[PDB]
């Protein structure tokens, strides 16, 4: 009797979880695998599921994180080594404010080249570059302002051809088929890409938000630089290939600082708005950045919200880096929530009605759609979690010369 129960518990050791009373549609199944998130018919199905090939991927995939999770916390020498590594990443080839001077002048050169024959237009630096929330080899986000007596896809015809006859740059992709039609360029001084978008005001507002946070908090730049670089080496930052957007990585690390108690950034909505309700959070729509320490808001009444605290970081950067990797490898349950840095408590998928079997992330000035829908394949999802696993494996591992 009970020996058969202990042997089906030996099946449960390989992640088969039984039920006794079930939903009428779930009457078909006595078991479930929480790794595969798929209901399982019976004890024979459990015997099947211990052989089942996705579960074998799921078993090893789940067992992998326990190693890195057990890998040791940094010693003071290890802390110094981690800090030295991330600052030399940030400085030697990462885009600091000093390198941002070069990238801003590159954006100015793009403006010069394009507005040589589109003088009414104007090109605006924004995105991960301008924030200093950057990476070593990066693409500058450039935004065309244009008079609205013309169509921006039509205007991109007048944008592309100069670059298609340019003498300064390489990598001129005719990237009209992107969701925002752009023309791409590679500056050859920095050796790095450039992307010429237009009219993306909400991205520029989030850019000013993150730049204000970096003005308040220094670690901001170094930490995200590091994270982005890592994701790139790990090819997670390519949103077209089932990955996560870099903008979304920036908001991800902002959420990390927003939740790593004591949180080194302050949240945008709360009790200082007297009579605020998080259950009608959408009504409290934010507006433009004020003084690079505040963000505005307005509804149909309006005001501003603080982006600062009374003291900056006084904790070692390597500790911040290791716990930043620990946050989005082991702490933030990627599939259960939206990365929602509008609110201290995490906003769920069904709170914005989005599906669940991937990460969800929101734009700060547009909570309309998930900007993390690119993960859909569970194989690519397991690959991304495996890259995060390799991150928290190596960077928790001590070294030898």
């Amino acid at each position: 009797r009970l020996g058969l129960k202990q042997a089906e518990e030996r099946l449960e050791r390989d992640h088969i979880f039984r039920l006794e009373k079930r939903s009428p549609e779930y009457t078909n199944c006595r078991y479930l695998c929480k790794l595969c998130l798929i209901h399982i018919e019976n004890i024979q199905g459990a015997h099947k599921h211990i052989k089942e090939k996705r579960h074998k991927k799921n078993i090893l995939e789940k067992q992998e994180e326990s190693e890195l999770r057990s890998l040791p916390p940094p010693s003071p020498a290890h802390l110094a080594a981690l800090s030295v590594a991330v600052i030399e990443l940030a400085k030697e080839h990462g885009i600091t404010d000093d390198d941002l001077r070069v990238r801003q002048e590159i954006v100015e050169e793009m403006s010069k080249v394009i507005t040589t024959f589109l003088p009414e237009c104007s090109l605006r630096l924004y995105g991960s570059s301008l924030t200093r929330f950057a990476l070593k080899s990066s693409d500058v986000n450039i935004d065309i302002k244009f008079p609205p007596k013309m169509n921006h896809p039509d205007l991109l015809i007048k944008v592309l051809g100069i670059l298609k006859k340019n003498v300064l740059y390489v990598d001129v992709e005719s990237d009209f088929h992107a969701k925002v039609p752009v023309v791409v360029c590679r500056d050859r001084k920095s050796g790095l890409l450039c992307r010429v978008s237009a009219g993306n005001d909400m991205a520029c507002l989030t850019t000013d938000l993150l730049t204000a946070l970096g003005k308040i908090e220094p670690v901001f730049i170094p930490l995200v630089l590091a994270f982005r670089y890592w994701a790139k080496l790990c090819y997670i930052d390519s949103q077209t290939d089932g990955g996560i957007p870099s903008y979304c990585f920036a908001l991800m690390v902002m959420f990390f600082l927003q939740q790593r108690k004591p949180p080194l950034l302050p949240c945008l909505l709360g009790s200082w708005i007297e009579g605020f309700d998080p259950k009608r959070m959408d009504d409290f729509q934010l507006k433009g950045i004020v003084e690079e320490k505040f963000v505005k808001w307005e509804c149909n009444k309006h005001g501003k919200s603080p982006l600062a605290l009374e003291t900056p970081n006084r904790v070692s950067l390597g500790q911040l880096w290791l716990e930043l990797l620990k946050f989005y490898t082991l702490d933030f349950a990627l599939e259960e929530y939206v990365i929602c840095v509008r609110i201290q408590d995490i906003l769920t998928r069904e709170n914005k009605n989005w599906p669940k079997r991937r990460i969800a992330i929101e734009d700060p000035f547009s909570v309309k759609r998930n900007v993390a829908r690119s993960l859909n394949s569970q194989l690519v999802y397991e690959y991304v979690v495996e890259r995060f696993r390799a991150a928290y494996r190596y960077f928790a591992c001590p070294q030898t010369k």
Binding site: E8, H47, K51
Partner: protein
């Protein structure tokens, strides 16, 4: 085919080095009385795989003349069948049974019986009777 056939019974057979001896009841289709000794070797054996005989099973063969007992050119079982080998596609991990596998043996699962002491505690490869 040859005229040099024969038949009889196995005297003995080593599996590992692959030779033995036979005692023959027939020679070239002619019956014999008393039986004669005739060799068997794995280079002479017709079977595939690890060619071996049960040490006493019935056989058929072909021969040629030899001093240390007759030498076989070919050896088979009776009627040309494959020889057995010394008589002593895997054990079902639900029950230990060779004849079935996982979905072939869908009975409710069992804990680890140590086969050396016949108790459900551990594994026979860790039991010190080895």
């Amino acid at each position: 085919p040859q005229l040099l056939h024969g038949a009889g019974i196995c005297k003995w057979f080593n599996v590992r080095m692959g030779f033995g001896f036979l005692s023959m009841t027939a020679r070239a289709g002619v019956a014999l009385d008393p039986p004669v000794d005739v060799f068997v070797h794995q280079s002479k054996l017709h079977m595939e795989g690890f060619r071996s005989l049960k040490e006493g099973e019935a056989v058929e063969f072909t021969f040629k003349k030899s001093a240390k007992g007759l030498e076989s050119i070919r050896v088979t079982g009776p009627g040309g069948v494959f020889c057995i080998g010394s008589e002593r596609g895997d054990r079902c991990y639900n029950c230990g049974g060779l004849d079935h596998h996982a979905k072939e043996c869908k009975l409710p699962p069992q804990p680890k019986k140590c086969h050396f002491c016949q108790s459900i505690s551990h594994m026979v490869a860790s039991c010190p009777l080895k």
